[PDB]
Symmetry: C7
Subunit: 253 residues, 7 copies
Amino acid sequence: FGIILIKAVIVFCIGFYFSFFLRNKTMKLLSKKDEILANFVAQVTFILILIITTIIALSTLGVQTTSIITVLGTVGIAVALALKDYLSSIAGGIILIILHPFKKGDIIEISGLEGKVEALNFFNTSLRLHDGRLAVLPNRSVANSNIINSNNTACRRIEWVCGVGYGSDIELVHKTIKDVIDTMEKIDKNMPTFIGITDFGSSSLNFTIRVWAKIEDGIFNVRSELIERIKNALDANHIEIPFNKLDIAIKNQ
Amino acid sequence: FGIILIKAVIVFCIGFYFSFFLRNKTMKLLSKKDEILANFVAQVTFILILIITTIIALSTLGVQTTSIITVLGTVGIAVALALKDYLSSIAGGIILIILHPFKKGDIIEISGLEGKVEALNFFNTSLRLHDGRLAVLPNRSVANSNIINSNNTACRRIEWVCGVGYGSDIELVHKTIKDVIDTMEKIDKNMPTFIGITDFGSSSLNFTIRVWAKIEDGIFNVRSELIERIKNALDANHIEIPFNKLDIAIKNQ
Amino acid sequence: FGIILIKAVIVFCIGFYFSFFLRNKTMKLLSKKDEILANFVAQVTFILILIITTIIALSTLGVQTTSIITVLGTVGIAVALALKDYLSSIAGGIILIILHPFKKGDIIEISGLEGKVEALNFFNTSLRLHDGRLAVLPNRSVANSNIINSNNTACRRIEWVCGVGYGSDIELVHKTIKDVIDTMEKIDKNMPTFIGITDFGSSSLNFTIRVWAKIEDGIFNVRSELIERIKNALDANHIEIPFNKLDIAIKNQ
Amino acid sequence: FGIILIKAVIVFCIGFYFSFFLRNKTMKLLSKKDEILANFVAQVTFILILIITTIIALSTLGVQTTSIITVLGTVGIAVALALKDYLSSIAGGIILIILHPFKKGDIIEISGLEGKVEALNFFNTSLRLHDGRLAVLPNRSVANSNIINSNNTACRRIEWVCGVGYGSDIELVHKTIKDVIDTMEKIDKNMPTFIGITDFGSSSLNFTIRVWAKIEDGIFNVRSELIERIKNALDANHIEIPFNKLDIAIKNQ
Amino acid sequence: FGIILIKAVIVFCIGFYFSFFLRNKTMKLLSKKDEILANFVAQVTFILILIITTIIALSTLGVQTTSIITVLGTVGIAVALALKDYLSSIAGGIILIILHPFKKGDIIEISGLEGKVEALNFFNTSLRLHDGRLAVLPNRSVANSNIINSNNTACRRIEWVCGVGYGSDIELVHKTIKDVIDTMEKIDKNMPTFIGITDFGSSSLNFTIRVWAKIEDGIFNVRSELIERIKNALDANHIEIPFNKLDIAIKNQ
Amino acid sequence: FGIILIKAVIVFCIGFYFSFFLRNKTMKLLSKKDEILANFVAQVTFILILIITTIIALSTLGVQTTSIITVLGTVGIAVALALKDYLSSIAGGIILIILHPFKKGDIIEISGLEGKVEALNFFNTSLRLHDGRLAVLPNRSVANSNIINSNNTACRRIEWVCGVGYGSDIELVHKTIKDVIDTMEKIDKNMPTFIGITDFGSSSLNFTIRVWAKIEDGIFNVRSELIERIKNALDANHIEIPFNKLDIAIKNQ
Amino acid sequence: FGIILIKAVIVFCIGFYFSFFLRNKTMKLLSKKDEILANFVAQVTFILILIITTIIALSTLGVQTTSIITVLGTVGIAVALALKDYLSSIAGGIILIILHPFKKGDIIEISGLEGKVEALNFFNTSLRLHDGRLAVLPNRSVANSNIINSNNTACRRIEWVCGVGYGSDIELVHKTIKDVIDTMEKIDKNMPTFIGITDFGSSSLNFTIRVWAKIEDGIFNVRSELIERIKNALDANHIEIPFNKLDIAIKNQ
């Protein structure tokens, strides 16, 4: 009866050694990066090569391994699952790096959060915000949301709704602004300006100002000076900016 | 006992070479596009053709490869899974390109974000916004939301709720507007206008103005001038636009 | 040893030709519709018919194809997955077309977005809005939301909360409206009207008007004119519509 | 060598005819319902029975069909997937019809949307709303939300927060209402009433009125008349309903 | 050649009858419940036992049924999937009934919707609301949300933010309330009361009243009467409850 | 021909008995806990042991069981799926009990809902709220949300924004509070206090008060007394807490 | 007939003992950590090694184990599924620990919840909040949200919108602040300051102040003092900070 019975501990041990050489070529070509990693890829690659060796050695004896493989299968599957989201941050980065419509130094607006890019981690992306802290956005997140590059086009629009005296003229202000526009140093004339009465206001009339500028000096800055001159001028032309107006009627009871 | 034992390293090497020719016909008809790409499709196509050759070579020896194939399966599956979303951006595009109710130069409103289209990447779509930065919308997202083409129909409605002296006549204003409508240059007569009292207001009476215009020189221009003349006229007819009215009653305690 | 060694290149090629006749009966009964489509269904149908032939030909040699099949499988699966959502827009339409509670020319209100229907694409659905732009709603989206047909029933209710002098009588107004109701040309008498005091208001008393009308010439027109006469009459009966009333008490400190 | 080689076109054709008899017993006991349906179930049932007979006929030749079945498998799966949601509208209906806590003529409140039921489609459900349009709610949606039957219980509570002069008595009004309650024709006495001061108000004192009534005649009218009487009475008892009170203190600067 | 060819119509019919006895022992121990149910479980159990008999009979002939079983599998799978959510309402109920931290007669607040329980259907749960209509919540929904039993504990807290004259004393009101607390018939002394100044108010100072009561005759009653006494008392101690106070400063322009 | 034909009813019955002994060792070591459970685990364990015995007995006859196993699998799978979420409440608990960063008597804030813990059911978790009712939170929910233990750290911060006469001094109040702080019995000195001007207010200046206290006698009380002293003192130092200030300008029209 | 019949109870028991040695080397290497854990891994590893032994011993008899394995499979799968999310908290942590862009002592802002990190549990993460309670964030959650490290960059921006007399000069305040900036001890000069008129206000004009500071002493104190000096100075320069301005018009009716 003997050869099977022997062929088993022949095989079982033949591979069982190969658990050392592959726990230690795991530890050889990748270990001494971290304790956590050297003993995780050397624990798992090991125990795995082990359980494959056990299953295989029971197979040479003539045992039904269909039952164990069903368990190993349905194990491996809960594993496939834990790492779904992590590995999708990984191939998130793989696709990001490879196909990039984004690269380091650009500034963007991922999901409402705008900052200049600092890092393309294996799984993570890092922004140093205008706040100046560093957000660490997992690649998974990034690769699928609307990535809004601000850097990829050199000029950007600017806007207002500058409330006037609700009683000033359609063209008075239409020229005081058309004048302050020009007096601006930081402004483009090749890019149009749409400055009209946008809407009836509650206590003030509201003028939109659409203007363009260059990415280079602007941020928010240009808008702040634009207003500092459309004040210096609207204040100057005996043109009113109204505090909330209210029409009181009085009656006693 | 020998032939199996030999047929193994026969086979094993036979294919094992074929790891060079397909690491290097991977590197041959695809590489030199990028370091990342050339060593990723050449690392994976390789390591794969390798693990297939090992398994096959152990199969010629008479070994149960059901155990390893179960692991290879349940690996490949975690892989199937990481690339679900990416590859659904890809065939997103494929469908997008092929079936298009959209094409470059059109302006649309994908998910609240309106801009003219600049790019149909493999996975990505790019809009230069009216802001003027370029959003990079993954195809996945696009192929499944409500794509609102503004370009595919030549004319668009415009609207108001123009507040009036809450005491002015139902037909007075009904004609001052029917007059300013006509005096407008940029305005269609073949397309209806619905200008009636929409609602009782809190401090003002509210008139809707529904009007149509052409895509060609419209957007916002038309509406802003429309208002610039419905003020130039409503201001002109001794018709009041009210600041918020309030009926104070007084009593002491 | 020969025959299998030969039967391989027999078979392998036997089918390998059939890669041409099915690359080009792919290109024959389907191509010339587009470059993207003719070379996509002719690339894929091809490469596939190829990898099936390879696998088959290694099978006639006595090679374990379990390893490759497991990869082919786990590939095909990531594919099954990318097209989950697209193909569910497809059979979305299939169901939509087939079982329709909806058909072209009807107006509806899919997910808050109301417009007349213009297109039933294979995947997509198109509405020309009352805006007049054309939304392109993927079938996947439509087939599963509450589809609100406005066209399927000939008559629709209309409503108000018409604020009055908070001091006028429960029946005074109850008759001025019951009078303006009748004087209306565009109104149904077979459909009831529920006009009564709905709620105590903050500065005004609030009357609901529930009235019915016909789809034919309704929408905007009816409700706006109804108000134009319930003003022409309420203004006329020395019945007040109040601006926000406020009871000031005064005391110094 | 012959018989296999022959047994193939034997088999292959044997079933290959059965493509006609099952394209046309598809077209026989089901078609003529529609063009879309007669040629869809006759195209698919067909191409299916075809690809089954191909695979089978290559099987009688001794070919590895594991390759093709893997593809047929992983195809069928993307199909399983497109129709997940549709078919769950179907078995949505099956469970709905079968186990119903709802039936036609009842009025309900599915997801905030209340209307009387008009249809139980195979996948869809239809309500003619109070509005009078007909919503078409897919069975999938319905079978899983909180279905709120209003018809399944004969009596319903009604409510207020009736603001009073903030200075009137805890019992004065507590009786004026207990009196208007009784004077109501449309009200139940074996159903309690909880009419107490519910909350200190900002400018007014707030009384809750909890009352019951019958489903038969209460659509809006009961609450609306209720108030038409609690006005006819509160107005009458020299009990104030206040416009927003405000205690002004004055000081100059 | 005969026996196989015969063993087929032997087998095929042998089971084929067993389609009658199992369409009719489907119809025998389960039917006459409904028409929908008796012909659904008798259609399906049948068609199924049919397609199992066809496949088996082609198997005795030596035909490859790997192709058909792949389709039968991939069908059965689109089925597993339509009934994922329904059958999880079912085992929802199974777990609910079995492990209950809830049973009929208790009142709860599932997902913001509070009512006394009336039904534990197979898949559904029914509440008669304090509205008095009966919601029908599918078991799926219930077994997984926060089920907030109100009935499982005999006493419940009550609360206020009772605005005072912002000028009254920290302890004056602190005793008027400590006095109104005791004078209440419906209150617990073994359960603490936390009545302090909670927050500076905008126009009024704000006092929290935390008090306990018994489920038996509480709900709304106790709080409404508690307030009717803390008004009867606060109104009485020359302690002001203020209408919104405002400090007007005046200057002309 | 016999033995097979006999070996079937040999086997089939051999196990078929074993349906009794395992219906009744189901009923033996588990039943009498409930009727629902004794006849559910005794119905399912049974019918299952039955369908396995049928399939096995047709296998000894030489019948293709691949058909039926395909249905048994694809059934078992719609079952795996219904109990996904229940059994994840289960192993939710298993994990919760095992690795607890939480144990009974702690108070927490799971998803906005804060209460002291009363129960760790198999699947459920119960909190008696500060309300005093008992919520029954499924383990599934808990094991995955941010579990905010309040009990696990002995001291907690407290906060204000205490509005002051917008004209008072930066240090006046800065010391009146620094004094009331000290006068407090219930307060920690080893824990810092950050009491400065946080923000310009609309009608009042706003001071934050950050202070620490002990879990022992605190929560909300210490805050309420803190304020009763910072009123007793701020009221006392001729330091104003302002009612909303408003700067009226007057002009007629 | 014997040997099979014997080989069964040979095998069955051979492994059946091995249920003791692997229930008790489960209990040997792992047990005594807890009762829950020692009898859970010793119950499951056991019952499992048991059901594998039974299936295997019926296999050596010649029984079709395809039916049982289908059930063991489809069981194992509902198990794979319960532990999806838990095990993804596990490999969440594994990836967190190994790849960290985060480490203990850093402060972050995980999903709106900012606190210093105290724990990296196997599954959980713990923050002691500014509040000072300890939140217990499951790793699953963390590894996938935007982890915002505040600690990883040494300097942070600060901001305002400091309202001024709407009538003061564009440069008056532009210098009072540029002066208060400098007078500040805790402020960086190498980091820019953008102090301009950001927007027209309703009752006040609004100045943004963008300034930088150092992580080390800043918190929220540097802003509070900044303001305490921009008050000490703005108050000082006869520069008004306005209470809400309102332009009253009066007319009687």
